[PDB]
């Protein structure tokens, strides 16, 4: 299983990027999709989750409002749509599968991450 | 009868739709019940698409296929309970395992302590380890007891709260009860906790 | 329109025991009567139907041929009659009212339902006998938990309040579950702030009024 | 009270109509007096219409403009034609009678089991 997240790049802020992680070797339409971020020197922080079509989407505080998942389960696609963005976002972002189709976060396949950085 | 969605998650006012597989009995239609906790179970929709005298409007039937459905357009903040869909068969009726809707809030991950038993109860030769996982959000959640690194299996019960009226949280206990004898065979005692919010789990522990 | 249950105890397992379910208001020798159970923690489960006469009656196979109906119309009411009492049957029984002729209308277009329910009654089957807790201290180790060990009572229910309800604030006291003993057990928690563990006592008081049972129990670091 | 038969109940669309047909079980000489109940299902019995032996068609008093009763005096069979349908006549609807079985004995009651009658979208 392989997970590839893109989109990242150099943002200003207020502006707006959609991330994308593409998963092979594993059929996505099963498993919630989650996006974390780590700034440096930080924890990996929880982002949001797509859970399977149908069982909603859940979010962290941070991103609330301004960033929403999506998924293409036909293409074993997830996508992080990211709008008004702060600083604050600036970040390694990174996909990961929840392995576990009853959602308890059994993220046993981590994407490599892209990079995001909102600055002018 | 298989409801199909089972823990629909929710904000106010919104839309929302449920459905009931009919588990291909003879199909004579649907009619839709409320209950709250520990009360007495309403009529809601009879004949799956007809309302019963005197209740609000927002609710709806309908006979998609052969899969009935039940749309709510907007959610009143009191609408918050679990429905039930109620086929008739040939001789004897059947209620559907039934949903339950719930309050949309923004994912939180449980605060995990652990409790050692007390010197009072392992005298009486009992241990009860506590584990305590408070204020988190959605509902699933995973306790594992380590006991000298060693996953156990059998010797533990879970209670878990209903939702906060305020926050809209769960918390749970888990307890793991051994002999006063088997307790005294070892050193560490933890309990490893997984959530969805969680990046990695959690454990706390002690040294007996 | 007052359904009204009535007749729920305790029962030693395969005992047996009436239910009566008081009609009031409507023409009973209309109407049918449904007796819907529900576990502890489930979903509803249908389990018998009599109709004015005795000439009909269906039922359902969890308690096919242990369980007895029976009506009266004297007195519009109507009587369960149940034998060999197995410890799952532990449940809360309703009354429902609905059509007569239930049967004879079903079909793909419609259902009629049950209108009236009444309130319910709490038989529970056990070998239990009634016994208050053991108290037990869950000792604190910005925010901290404690809490109390509420272990082996019987029947429901108990409360548990802290510092004689001047703390409410953060109390979790978490819902009974039933051990292999056939007694319940429960913990109450609450967090509090980590720098008030030297300076304030926390007391959990307890009370099983089957038992008469009252403990306090000081909960120290 | 059985061996009355009614039939013709039906899912119909708001302001469709249908004809209802109450009936007898064998061989019946006459039905001096009908009339037609309704018991939605969070009600009562409520009553919608009433032939006499002879005629006198009286209605309810929500009801005049859409319900037809008549008879049938060549097969006995009281009818009962509604028209222009509305989201508020859903239920069944039974059928009472005073049957007389033979051209002397004496009259006796009779009352149906009644058919469902769905009306929506």
């Known amino acids: 299983v392989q997970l590839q997240e893109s989109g990242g790049g150099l943002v200003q802020p207020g502006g707006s990027l959609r991330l994308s992680c593409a998963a092979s070797?594993?059929?996505?339409?099963?498993?919630?999709m989650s996006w974390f971020r780590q700034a440096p020197g930080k924890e990996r922080e929880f982002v949001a989750v797509?859970?399977?079509?149908?069982?909603?989407?859940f979010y962290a505080d941070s991103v609330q409002g301004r960033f929403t998942v999506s998924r293409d389960d036909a293409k074993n696609t997830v996508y992080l749509q990211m709008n008004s963005l702060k600083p604050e976002d600036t970040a390694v972002y990174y996909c990961?599968?929840?392995?576990?189709?009853?959602?308890?976060?059994?993220?046993?396949?981590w994407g490599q991450g892209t990079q995001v950085t909102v600055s002018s | 009868m298989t409801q199909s969605p089972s823990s629909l998650s929710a904000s106010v006012g919104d839309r929302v739709t449920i459905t009931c597989r009919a588990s291909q009995s003879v199909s004579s239609a649907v009619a839709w019940y409320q209950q709250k906790p520990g009360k007495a179970p309403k009529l809601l929709i009879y004949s799956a698409s007809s309302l019963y005298s005197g209740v609000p409007s927002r609710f709806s039937g309908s006979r998609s296929g052969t899969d009935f459905t039940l749309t709510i357009s907007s959610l009143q903040p009191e609408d918050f309970a679990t429905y039930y869909c109620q086929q008739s068969s040939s001789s004897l009726i059947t209620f559907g395992q039934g949903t339950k809707v719930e309050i949309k809030r923004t994912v939180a991950a449980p605060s995990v302590f652990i409790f050692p038993p007390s010197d009072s109860q392992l005298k009486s030769g009992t241990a009860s380890v506590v584990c305590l996982l408070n204020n988190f959000y959605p509902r699933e959640a995973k306790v594992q007891w380590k006991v000298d690194n060693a996953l156990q299996s059998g010797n533990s019960q879970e209670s878990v709260t209903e939702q906060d009226s305020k926050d809209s949280t769960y918390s749970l206990s888990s307890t793991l009860t051994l002999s006063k004898a088997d307790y005294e065979k070892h050193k560490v005692y933890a309990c490893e906790v997984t959530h969805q919010g969680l990046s990695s789990p959690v454990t706390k522990s002690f040294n007996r | 329109v007052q359904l009204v249950e009535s007749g729920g105890g305790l029962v030693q397992p395969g005992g047996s025991l009436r239910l009566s379910c008081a009609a009031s208001g409507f023409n009973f020798s209309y109407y049918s009567i449904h007796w819907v159970r529900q576990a502890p923690g489930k979903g509803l489960e249908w389990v018998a139907y009599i109709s004015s006469s005795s000439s009909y009656t269906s039922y359902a196979d969890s308690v096919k041929g242990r369980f007895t109906i029976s009506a009266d119309t004297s007195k519009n009411t109507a009587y369960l009659q149940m034998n060999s009492l197995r410890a799952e049957d532990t449940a809360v029984y309703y009354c429902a009212r609905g059509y007569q002729y239930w049967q004879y209308h079903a079909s793909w277009y419609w259902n009629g339902g049950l209108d009236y329910w009444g309130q319910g009654t709490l038989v529970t089957v056990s070998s239990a006998s009634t016994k208050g807790p053991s108290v037990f201290p869950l000792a604190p180790s910005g925010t901290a938990a404690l809490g109390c060990l509420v272990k082996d009572y019987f029947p429901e229910p108990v409360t548990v309040s802290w510092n004689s309800g001047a703390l409410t604030s953060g109390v979790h006291t978490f819902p009974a579950v039933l051990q292999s003993s056939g007694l319940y057990s429960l913990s109450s928690v609450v967090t509090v702030p980590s720098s008030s563990l030297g300076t304030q006592t926390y007391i959990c008081n307890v009370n099983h009024k089957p038992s008469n049972t009252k403990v306090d129990k000081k909960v120290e670091p | 009270q059985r061996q009355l038969v009614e039939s013709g109940g039906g899912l119909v669309q708001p302001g469709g109509s249908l004809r209802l047909s109450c009936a007898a079980s064998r061989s019946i000489f006459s039905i001096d007096t009908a009339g037609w109940f309704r018991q939605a299902p969070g009600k009562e019995r409520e009553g919608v219409a009433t032939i006499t032996r002879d005629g006198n068609a009286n209605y309810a008093d929500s009801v005049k403009g859409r319900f037809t009763i008549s008879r049938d005096r060549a097969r006995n069979t009281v009818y009962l034609q509604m028209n222009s349908l509305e989201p508020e006549d859903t239920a069944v609807y039974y059928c009472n009678a005073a049957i007389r079985t033979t051209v002397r004995t004496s009259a006796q009651e009779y009352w149906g089991k009644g058919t469902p009658v769905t009306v929506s979208s």
């Open positions: 990961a599968i929840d392995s576990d189709t009853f959602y308890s976060g059994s993220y046993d396949y």
């Open positions: 070797g594993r059929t996505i339409s099963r498993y919630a």
């Open positions: 797509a859970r399977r079509s149908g069982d909603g989407a």
